[PDB]
Amino acid sequence: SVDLEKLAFGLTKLNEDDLVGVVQMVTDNKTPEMNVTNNVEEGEFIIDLYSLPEGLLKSLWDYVKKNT
Amino acid sequence: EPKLLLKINLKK
């Protein structure tokens, strides 16, 4: 089970391209219930890891480990 | 109860 606070911290350790890749993976897998905010006008995303399913969280964690 | 929200601002 992914530690969500370590995930959130580790996500900020990615470079710009890899963090965009996180945004890509999340928007491609998102449903309304995962409470992802995407202000399309402002080009900003707000990810609530606590609303993501465990498989996506695991994919994000492995992605962080692979790219740091 | 603490929650870390991750805000990501993209290039426009």
Short mmCIF file of N, CA and C in Angstrom, two decimals:
data_model
loop_
_atom_site.label_atom_id
_atom_site.label_comp_id
_atom_site.label_asym_id
_atom_site.label_seq_id
_atom_site.Cartn_x
_atom_site.Cartn_y
_atom_site.Cartn_z
N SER A 1 0.84 -1.19 0.00
CA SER A 1 0.00 0.00 0.00
C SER A 1 0.88 1.25 0.00
N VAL A 2 0.66 2.13 -0.99
CA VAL A 2 1.53 3.28 -1.17
C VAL A 2 1.36 4.27 -0.03
N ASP A 3 2.48 4.77 0.49
CA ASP A 3 2.45 5.85 1.47
C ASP A 3 2.19 7.14 0.69
N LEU A 4 1.01 7.73 0.89
CA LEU A 4 0.58 8.83 0.03
C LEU A 4 1.39 10.10 0.25
N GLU A 5 1.85 10.34 1.47
CA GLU A 5 2.61 11.55 1.74
C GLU A 5 4.02 11.45 1.17
N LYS A 6 4.61 10.25 1.23
CA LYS A 6 5.89 10.02 0.57
C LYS A 6 5.74 10.09 -0.94
N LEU A 7 4.59 9.65 -1.46
CA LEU A 7 4.32 9.77 -2.89
C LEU A 7 4.26 11.24 -3.30
N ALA A 8 3.47 12.03 -2.56
CA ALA A 8 3.32 13.45 -2.89
C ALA A 8 4.67 14.15 -2.86
N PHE A 9 5.46 13.90 -1.81
CA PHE A 9 6.79 14.48 -1.73
C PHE A 9 7.66 14.02 -2.89
N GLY A 10 7.67 12.71 -3.17
CA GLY A 10 8.51 12.20 -4.24
C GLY A 10 8.13 12.74 -5.60
N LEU A 11 6.84 13.03 -5.80
CA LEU A 11 6.40 13.60 -7.06
C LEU A 11 7.05 14.96 -7.33
N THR A 12 7.30 15.75 -6.28
CA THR A 12 7.96 17.04 -6.47
C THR A 12 9.43 16.90 -6.80
N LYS A 13 9.99 15.70 -6.69
CA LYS A 13 11.39 15.46 -7.01
C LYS A 13 11.60 15.14 -8.48
N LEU A 14 10.52 15.03 -9.25
CA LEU A 14 10.63 14.77 -10.68
C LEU A 14 11.00 16.04 -11.42
N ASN A 15 11.69 15.88 -12.55
CA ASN A 15 11.90 17.04 -13.40
C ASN A 15 10.59 17.41 -14.10
N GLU A 16 10.64 18.51 -14.86
CA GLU A 16 9.42 19.07 -15.45
C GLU A 16 8.76 18.08 -16.40
N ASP A 17 9.55 17.47 -17.29
CA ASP A 17 8.99 16.52 -18.24
C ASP A 17 8.37 15.32 -17.53
N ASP A 18 9.07 14.76 -16.55
CA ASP A 18 8.53 13.60 -15.85
C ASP A 18 7.28 13.96 -15.05
N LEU A 19 7.20 15.18 -14.53
CA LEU A 19 6.00 15.56 -13.79
C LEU A 19 4.82 15.76 -14.74
N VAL A 20 5.08 16.28 -15.94
CA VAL A 20 4.05 16.32 -16.98
C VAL A 20 3.59 14.92 -17.33
N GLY A 21 4.52 13.96 -17.33
CA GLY A 21 4.13 12.57 -17.55
C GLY A 21 3.22 12.04 -16.46
N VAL A 22 3.41 12.50 -15.22
CA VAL A 22 2.47 12.18 -14.14
C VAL A 22 1.10 12.75 -14.45
N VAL A 23 1.06 14.01 -14.88
CA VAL A 23 -0.20 14.64 -15.25
C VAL A 23 -0.87 13.87 -16.38
N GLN A 24 -0.08 13.43 -17.36
CA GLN A 24 -0.61 12.64 -18.47
C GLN A 24 -1.25 11.36 -17.97
N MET A 25 -0.52 10.61 -17.14
CA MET A 25 -1.04 9.34 -16.64
C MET A 25 -2.31 9.55 -15.82
N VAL A 26 -2.35 10.61 -15.00
CA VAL A 26 -3.52 10.83 -14.16
C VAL A 26 -4.72 11.23 -14.99
N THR A 27 -4.54 12.17 -15.93
CA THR A 27 -5.69 12.59 -16.72
C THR A 27 -6.19 11.47 -17.62
N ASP A 28 -5.30 10.59 -18.09
CA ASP A 28 -5.72 9.48 -18.94
C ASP A 28 -6.48 8.41 -18.17
N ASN A 29 -6.34 8.37 -16.85
CA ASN A 29 -6.97 7.34 -16.04
C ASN A 29 -8.05 7.89 -15.13
N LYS A 30 -8.29 9.19 -15.16
CA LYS A 30 -9.13 9.81 -14.16
C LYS A 30 -10.62 9.59 -14.45
N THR A 31 -11.39 9.56 -13.38
CA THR A 31 -12.84 9.54 -13.37
C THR A 31 -13.28 10.67 -12.45
N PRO A 32 -14.55 11.08 -12.52
CA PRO A 32 -14.99 12.16 -11.63
C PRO A 32 -14.78 11.86 -10.16
N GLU A 33 -14.84 10.59 -9.76
CA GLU A 33 -14.71 10.23 -8.35
C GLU A 33 -13.29 10.40 -7.82
N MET A 34 -12.27 10.48 -8.67
CA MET A 34 -10.93 10.68 -8.11
C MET A 34 -10.60 12.13 -7.84
N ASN A 35 -11.54 13.05 -8.05
CA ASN A 35 -11.46 14.41 -7.51
C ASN A 35 -10.22 15.15 -8.00
N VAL A 36 -9.83 14.88 -9.25
CA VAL A 36 -8.73 15.59 -9.87
C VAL A 36 -9.24 16.92 -10.40
N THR A 37 -8.62 18.01 -9.97
CA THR A 37 -8.95 19.33 -10.48
C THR A 37 -8.04 19.64 -11.66
N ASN A 38 -8.65 19.99 -12.79
CA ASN A 38 -7.90 20.43 -13.97
C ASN A 38 -8.54 21.72 -14.46
N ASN A 39 -8.02 22.85 -13.98
CA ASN A 39 -8.40 24.16 -14.49
C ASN A 39 -7.80 24.29 -15.88
N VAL A 40 -8.61 23.97 -16.88
CA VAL A 40 -8.14 23.91 -18.26
C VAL A 40 -7.76 25.30 -18.75
N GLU A 41 -8.50 26.33 -18.33
CA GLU A 41 -8.15 27.70 -18.70
C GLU A 41 -6.77 28.10 -18.18
N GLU A 42 -6.44 27.70 -16.96
CA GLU A 42 -5.22 28.14 -16.31
C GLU A 42 -4.07 27.16 -16.47
N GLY A 43 -4.29 26.03 -17.13
CA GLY A 43 -3.24 25.04 -17.31
C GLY A 43 -2.72 24.46 -16.01
N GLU A 44 -3.59 24.28 -15.02
CA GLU A 44 -3.15 23.79 -13.72
C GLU A 44 -3.95 22.56 -13.31
N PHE A 45 -3.26 21.67 -12.61
CA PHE A 45 -3.81 20.43 -12.11
C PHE A 45 -3.66 20.43 -10.60
N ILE A 46 -4.66 19.92 -9.90
CA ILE A 46 -4.52 19.65 -8.47
C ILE A 46 -4.88 18.19 -8.26
N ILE A 47 -3.91 17.40 -7.84
CA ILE A 47 -4.09 15.97 -7.61
C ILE A 47 -4.31 15.74 -6.13
N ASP A 48 -5.40 15.05 -5.81
CA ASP A 48 -5.69 14.57 -4.47
C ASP A 48 -5.39 13.07 -4.48
N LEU A 49 -4.20 12.71 -4.01
CA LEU A 49 -3.79 11.31 -4.04
C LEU A 49 -4.72 10.44 -3.20
N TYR A 50 -5.36 11.03 -2.19
CA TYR A 50 -6.23 10.29 -1.28
C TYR A 50 -7.52 9.83 -1.94
N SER A 51 -7.81 10.32 -3.14
CA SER A 51 -9.00 9.93 -3.89
C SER A 51 -8.66 9.01 -5.06
N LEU A 52 -7.35 8.63 -5.24
CA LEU A 52 -6.98 7.78 -6.35
C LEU A 52 -7.04 6.31 -5.94
N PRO A 53 -7.37 5.42 -6.88
CA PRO A 53 -7.34 3.99 -6.58
C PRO A 53 -5.91 3.49 -6.39
N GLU A 54 -5.81 2.36 -5.69
CA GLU A 54 -4.51 1.86 -5.26
C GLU A 54 -3.62 1.47 -6.44
N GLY A 55 -4.21 0.98 -7.53
CA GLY A 55 -3.40 0.63 -8.69
C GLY A 55 -2.72 1.84 -9.31
N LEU A 56 -3.47 2.94 -9.45
CA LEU A 56 -2.90 4.17 -9.98
C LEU A 56 -1.85 4.74 -9.04
N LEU A 57 -2.11 4.69 -7.73
CA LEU A 57 -1.12 5.14 -6.76
C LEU A 57 0.15 4.31 -6.86
N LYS A 58 0.01 2.99 -7.01
CA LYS A 58 1.18 2.14 -7.18
C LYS A 58 1.93 2.48 -8.46
N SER A 59 1.20 2.74 -9.55
CA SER A 59 1.86 3.13 -10.80
C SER A 59 2.62 4.44 -10.62
N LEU A 60 2.03 5.39 -9.90
CA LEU A 60 2.70 6.67 -9.66
C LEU A 60 3.94 6.49 -8.80
N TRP A 61 3.85 5.66 -7.76
CA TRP A 61 4.99 5.44 -6.88
C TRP A 61 6.15 4.80 -7.63
N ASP A 62 5.87 3.73 -8.38
CA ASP A 62 6.91 3.10 -9.18
C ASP A 62 7.48 4.08 -10.20
N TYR A 63 6.63 4.94 -10.76
CA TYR A 63 7.09 5.97 -11.69
C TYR A 63 8.06 6.93 -11.02
N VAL A 64 7.76 7.32 -9.78
CA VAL A 64 8.65 8.20 -9.04
C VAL A 64 9.98 7.51 -8.78
N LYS A 65 9.93 6.26 -8.30
CA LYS A 65 11.16 5.53 -8.01
C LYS A 65 12.00 5.33 -9.26
N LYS A 66 11.35 5.06 -10.40
CA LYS A 66 12.09 4.81 -11.63
C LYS A 66 12.76 6.07 -12.17
N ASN A 67 12.21 7.25 -11.87
CA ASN A 67 12.70 8.49 -12.45
C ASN A 67 13.39 9.38 -11.42
N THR A 68 13.84 8.80 -10.32
CA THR A 68 14.68 9.49 -9.35
C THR A 68 15.78 8.54 -8.90
N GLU B 1 -6.53 16.43 10.58
CA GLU B 1 -6.17 15.43 9.59
C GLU B 1 -5.50 16.07 8.39
N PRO B 2 -4.22 15.75 8.18
CA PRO B 2 -3.46 16.39 7.10
C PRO B 2 -3.56 15.64 5.78
N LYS B 3 -3.67 16.41 4.70
CA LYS B 3 -3.62 15.88 3.35
C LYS B 3 -2.72 16.76 2.51
N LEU B 4 -1.75 16.16 1.84
CA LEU B 4 -0.91 16.88 0.89
C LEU B 4 -1.61 16.90 -0.46
N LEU B 5 -1.99 18.08 -0.92
CA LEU B 5 -2.48 18.25 -2.27
C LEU B 5 -1.32 18.64 -3.17
N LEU B 6 -1.25 18.02 -4.34
CA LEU B 6 -0.19 18.30 -5.30
C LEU B 6 -0.76 19.17 -6.41
N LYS B 7 -0.35 20.43 -6.43
CA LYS B 7 -0.74 21.37 -7.47
C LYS B 7 0.38 21.44 -8.50
N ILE B 8 0.03 21.23 -9.76
CA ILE B 8 0.99 21.26 -10.85
C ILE B 8 0.53 22.30 -11.85
N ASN B 9 1.37 23.30 -12.09
CA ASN B 9 1.08 24.34 -13.06
C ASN B 9 1.86 24.06 -14.33
N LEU B 10 1.15 23.98 -15.44
CA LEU B 10 1.76 23.66 -16.72
C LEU B 10 2.07 24.92 -17.51
N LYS B 11 2.91 24.76 -18.52
CA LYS B 11 3.17 25.82 -19.47
C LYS B 11 1.85 26.20 -20.16
N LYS B 12 1.71 27.48 -20.49
CA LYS B 12 0.48 27.91 -21.17
C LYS B 12 0.72 28.16 -22.65
#
